[PDB]
Amino acid sequence: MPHLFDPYRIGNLELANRIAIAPMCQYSAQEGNATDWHMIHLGQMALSGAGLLIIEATAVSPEGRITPTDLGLYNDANEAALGRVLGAVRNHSPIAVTIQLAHAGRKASSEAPWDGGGQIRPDQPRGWQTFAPSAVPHAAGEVPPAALDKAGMKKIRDDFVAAAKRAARLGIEGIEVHGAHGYLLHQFLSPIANHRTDEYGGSLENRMRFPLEVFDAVREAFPAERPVWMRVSATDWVPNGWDIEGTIALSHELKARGSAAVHVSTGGVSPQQAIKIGPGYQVPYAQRVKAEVGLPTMAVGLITEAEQAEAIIANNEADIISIARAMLYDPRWPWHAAAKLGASVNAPKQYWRSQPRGLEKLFKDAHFG
Amino acid sequence: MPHLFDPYRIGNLELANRIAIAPMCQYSAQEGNATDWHMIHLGQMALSGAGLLIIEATAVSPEGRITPTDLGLYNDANEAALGRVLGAVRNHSPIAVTIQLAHAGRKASSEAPWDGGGQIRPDQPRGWQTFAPSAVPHAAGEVPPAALDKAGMKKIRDDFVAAAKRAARLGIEGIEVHGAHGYLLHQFLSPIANHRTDEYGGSLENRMRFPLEVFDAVREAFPAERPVWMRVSATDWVPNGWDIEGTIALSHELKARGSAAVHVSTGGVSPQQAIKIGPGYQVPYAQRVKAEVGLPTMAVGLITEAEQAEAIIANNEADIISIARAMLYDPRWPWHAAAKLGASVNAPKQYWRSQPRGLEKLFKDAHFGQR
Ligand SMILES: Cc1cc2nc3c(=O)[nH]c(=O)nc-3n(C[C@H](O)[C@H](O)[C@H](O)COP(=O)(O)O)c2cc1C
């Protein structure tokens, strides 16, 4: 009889409950460096009582950023800036802190969403040359990426390794390899983006080959006891693209290769995607991945209500509920869920006076004697 | 026909709406210095879409702190530490940032709430000698404060002035002088704490004299264009103390002396109690101070729902509503209120995608595109 507020575990990392704060790009870094925005944002996310925080898509190289203001972990300055933020978080919260390591591939060199998200060309001041499995653009008329060669692919492997080591040194507790949302690894997985005719394209085994090498490299580099997993897009929502069968096959391989979990999202590789959006619309993909592969499975997508979240766990549809927008709109979401479902959470002492009367057990360890 | 989400103004300071974030002690400073907590906390508060943020009780001297971990503005280090927090706020928020300047008087040298809130004796670790209008402890068996002399009262005036100048140099946009919660100024106001026989105790005029000296000194020191006001307790719960008549007389004096507002605490009557009595105002004392004195009247609102706050404004009970606990339990309270009331709010661009599926146009001037 599983419940949202059961303690849980991914690999050896104990989680206070099944609630994860999904990775959410803030587009507020400067040359990859965390800024005051990140102390405010991650600081507040850490007070939420969620069991797990997944830091935003963190670029393994400058050219792997989505946008010029993405968070990075590709040099010592980036490491020190993020370390300042993490020190503050650890000072005020017991949350498990993990990080999503990322490379945008052909979707790199973009504007922030509030600036319309368009491609910035390599010839424009903030733009740069992008890389992908094949020299085909994400959308028609865009400046195409260069097709990766052997040394290019090695650089990416080595950059993921280097970033995973910096993350380890910072005391980060886990790594989510970004394999979703139309970014570099997903580009290799999907026949929409991957037109290669070497051993990294064509067949399913070939298309999975580089994403799995990247996974393996990170898993080797990161301390063995701390979990490493992948976020996947379960489908492209485009006929003949990546689909749930590819996802299941990849998930089996991830399990065989020591992944701690699979975080199941969808979409991102094609402007043609025909997404059927609605509450819990991506839960069926997580349910199937959980059923067939049996790794800890995180579900996400328009999960906004405590009873909805609880129902997903109760129905064995996922093991972890990932929440993004509902956390931005209510950074106390897990407190509020705990109040509705008769549970407790960790909260900073500064805010112990804050809950309504009648919820005297809501905050673990709270006292005033 | 006023509404919660109408723009408003205090002095020259334009406010996006009638929602103020109440000064809420965090007990998280080190020798008066703001810490990483204040960055995280004040950063959230500043991004809430409220019109006005009032920084917590900020000690004018170490001896004037409520606790050993109160926020202070009494030396250069205090100033620099707060400046770091404010600079982050300014990078990200359009909110008006103001500060409550404070001195705890006989209630100083106490523990934080999670440590039981007790007095720390002058001879214990972290403790210190407290000061007050008279040598009478807040509670029996506590170490009494020293009764202030002419020099001690001058130090306090000058400390308020010094802190007000530091606040101005930090670019803080307004000052709330703390005359409530049984702290130093309230101790002078109240015959319960003030047993002085000189020109500072006895009659109502004598009891208001030092609080009004402090207010005047702050108003003189702080840039004339920026608002300065006082926080006042509507009434004591006990007889022969401070009362609603005193509050009204003090609010008239504040107006004549160039106060921008008055911020009226509840006098111990919550909305749950108040709405059952008489006309059923939620903030009856604030309502009366507004009607009789005509200053911009901020009322402490012990409320959680948008509809409660709207009604306070729409029923002419207050011009600005300050919100404390509901802001801690929901730092997006003004977003949630705006959604209920059909209004919009300033939200940081980083969070514009958070708008629920139901809603549209919640966030002012939001735009989105993605490849
Ligand atoms: C502002 C914002 C930033 C995001 N950044 C990332 C990211 O860095 N990495 C990622 O895998 N997904 C990212 N996503 C997708 C979310 O993690 C999540 O999967 C998606 O928003 C659906 O969940 P929700 O309905 O709970 O918001 C982001 C979403 C938003 C709204």
Residue A113 to residue B352, Cβ atoms within 8 A: yes
Distance set, CA A187 to CA A139, A153, A184, A204, A211 (Å): 13, 13, 5, 13, 10
- Whether A36 and B113 lie within 8 Å, measured CB to CB: no
- Report DSSP state, residue A128: -
Tell how far the Cα of B39 is from the centroid of ligand 1, in angstroms. 25
- Secondary structure of A174-221 in the HEC alphabet? CEEEEECCCCHHHHHHCCCCCCCCCCCCCCHHHHHHHHHHHHHHHHHH
The closest CB to that of A325, out of B113, B349, B354, belongs to B354
Distance CA A26, CA A112 (A): 9
Q: Is A57 annotated as a binding residue?
A: yes
Distance of CA A88 from the midpoint of ligand 1 (Å): 23
What DSSP designation does A33 have?
Answer: B
Residues near ligand 1 with C-beta < 6 Å? Answer: A 22-25, 56-57, 100, 178, 180-181, 231, 265, 300-303, 323-326; B 353
| Closest-CA residue to B184 (of B97, B103, B112) | B103
Residue with the smallest CA separation from ligand 1 atom 1 is A24
Q: How far apart are CA A86 and CA A92, in angstroms?
A: 10
Give residues preceding each break in chain B, C–N over 2.5 A.
Answer: none
Residue type, B305: E
A90 touches chain B (CB under 8 A): no
B239 CB contacts (<8 Å, ≥6 apart)?
A: none
Q: What is the CATH number of domain B1-371?
A: 3.20.20.70
Was A68 annotated as part of a binding site?
A: no
Chain A 250-289, residues with CB within 8 Å of chain B CB atoms: 271
Q: What CA–CA distance (Å, rounded) separates B180 from B178?
A: 6
Question: Within 13 Å, how many C-alpha atoms sit on residue B12's CB side?
Answer: 5
- Cα dihedral value A280, A282, A284, A287, nearest 10: -100
How far does residue A37's CA lie from ligand 1's centre (Å)? 18
- Burial code of A279-309, b = ≥16 C-beta within 10 A, e = fewer? ebebbebbbbbbeebebbbbbbbbbbbbebb
What tokens were used for A367? 């006292």
Please indicate whether, in this complex, the C-beta atoms of A39 and B44 are within 8 angstroms of each other: no
The CA angle B195-B155-B178, to the nearest 5 degrees, is 65
Question: Of the candidates B79, B98, B89, which has an alpha carbon nearest to the alpha carbon of residue B320?
Answer: B98
Task: Give me the residue spans of the domains in chain A.
Answer: 1-369
Structure tokens at A156: 């990416």
- H or E segment and range at residue A44: helix A36-46
CB-count burial class (<10 Å; 0-12, 13-18, 19+) for A56: buried
- Header resolution in angstroms: 1.7
Looking at the CA of residue A66, tell me the nearest atom of ligand 1: 8
**End-to-end alpha carbon distance in chain A:** 37
Question: Contact B48/B331 with Cβ under 8 angstroms?
Answer: yes
CA distance A144 to A193: 11
What are the chain B neighbours of A44 within 8 Å (beta carbons)?
A: 40, 43-44, 331
Record the tokens describing residue B187, joined without a space: 């101790």
What are the C-alpha distances in Å from A290 to residues A226, A231, B353, B368? 21, 14, 29, 34
Q: What's the CA gap between A189 and A124, in Å, rounded?
A: 30
Smallest CA–CA distance, residue B84 to chain A, in Å, is: 10
Question: Does the distance separating the beta carbons of A27 and B369 come in below 8 Å?
Answer: no
Tell me A107's DSSP state: G
Query: Are the C-beta atoms of B131 and B146 separated by less than 8 Å?
Result: yes
> What would the two tokens of residue A271 be?
């402007």
Residues forming a β-bridge with A363:
A345
Q: Which residues contact A84 (CB under 8 A, 6 or more apart)?
A: A34, A39
Q: Retrieve residue A112's tokens.
A: 């922030």
Q: What is the CATH number that goes with domain A1-369?
A: 3.20.20.70
B147 near B193, Cβ under 8 Å?
Answer: no
- The CA distance from B219 to B271, in Å, is 33
B116 touches chain A (CB under 8 A): yes
The helix/strand/coil state of A303 is coil
Contacts of B25 in chain A (CB under 8 A): none
* Nearest CB partner across the interface for A350, out of B36, B41, B116: B41
Rounded-to-integer distance, Cα A131 and Cα A103, Å: 10
Q: Where are the beta strands (DSSP E) in chain A?
A: 8-10, 13-15, 19-21, 52-59, 96-102, 131-132, 146-147, 175-179, 228-233, 262-265, 297-299, 320-323
Contacts of B330 (CB under 8 A, 6+ apart): A330, A332, B336
Are A339 and A316 a contacting pair, CB within 8 Å?
no
Q: Is the dihedral of CA B199, B203, B207, B210 positive or negative?
A: negative
- A333 → chain B, closest CA residue: B330
10 Å CB burial of residue A178 (0-12, 13-18, 19+) is buried
Please give the helix or strand (H or E) that residue A329 lies within, else none.
helix A325-329
Dist. CA B351–CA B360, nearest whole Å:
14
Determined by X-ray
At A14, is the secondary structure helix, strand, or coil? strand
**Token representation of residue A33:** 């460096």
B183 catalytically annotated: yes
| C-alpha torsion A335→A340→A341→A345, nearest 10 | 10
- B83 in reach of chain A (CB within 8 A): no
Distance (Å) from the C-alpha of residue B236 to the closest C-alpha of chain A?
Answer: 23
Is B44–A119 a contact, with Cβ atoms under 8 angstroms apart? no
A187 contacts in B (CB within 8 Å)?
Answer: none
**3-state DSSP assignment of residue A82:** helix
The answer to whether residues B314 and B2 touch, using CB atoms and an 8 Å cutoff, is: yes
Q: Which two tokens stand for residue A38?
A: 């990140």
Contacts of A116 (CB under 8 A, 6+ apart): B367, B368, B369
| The one catalytic residue among B183, B200, B281, B285 | B183
Q: How far apart (Å, rounded) are the C-alpha atoms in residues A265 and A250?
A: 14
Chain A interface disruption, residue of B111, B329, B367, most A CBs within 10 A? B329
Question: Contact at 8 Å (CB) between A77 and B341?
Answer: no
Strands A228-233 and A13-15: unpaired
Among A27, A183, A200, A285, which one carries the catalytic annotation? A183
Say which amino acid occupies B73.
L
Task: Single out the residue of A311, A253, A252 nearest to residue A2, CA to CA.
Answer: A311
Residue among A38, A125, A43 nearest A331 (CA): A43
Q: How far apart are CA A126 and CA B231, in angstroms?
A: 50
Half-sphere exposure of B266 (CA within 13 A, CB side): 20
- Rounded to a whole number, what is the distance in Å from the CA of A257 to chain B's nearest CA? 32
- For chain B, give the secondary structure using H, E and C: CCCCCCCEEECCEEECCCEEECCCCCCCCECCECCHHHHHHHHHHHCCCCCEEEEEEEECCHHHCCCCCCCECCCHHHHHHHHHHHHHHHHHCCCEEEEEEECCHHHCCECCHHHCCCECCCCCCCCCCCEECCCCCCCCCCCCCEECCHHHHHHHHHHHHHHHHHHHHCCCCCEEEEECCCCHHHHHHCCCCCCCCCCCCCCHHHHHHHHHHHHHHHHHHCCCCCCEEEEEECCCCCCCCCCHHHHHHHHHHHHHCCCCCEEEECCCCCHHHHCCCCCCCCCHHHHHHHHHHCCCEEEECCCCCHHHHHHHHHCCCCCEEEECHHHHHCCCHHHHHHHHHCCCECCCHHHHHHCCCCCCCCECCCCCCCC
Encode burial over A131-154: b for 16+ CB neighbours within 10 A, e otherwise. bbbbebbbeeebbebeebeeeebe
Three-class HEC string of A239-269: CCCCCHHHHHHHHHHHHHCCCCCEEEECCCC
Q: State phi, psi for A354 to the nearest 5 degrees.
A: -85, -20
**Residue A128, token pair as written in the block:** 């740069």
The Cα A59–Cα A57 span in angstroms is 6
B314 φ/ψ angles, rounded to the nearest 5 degrees: -70, -30
Distance CA B13, CA B325 (A): 25
> Nearest-5° angle of CA B107, CA B323, CA B282?
100
Q: How far apart are CA B164 and CA A47, in angstroms?
A: 32
Q: Does A113 touch chain B (CB under 8 A)?
A: yes
Q: What is the DSSP letter of A353?
A: G
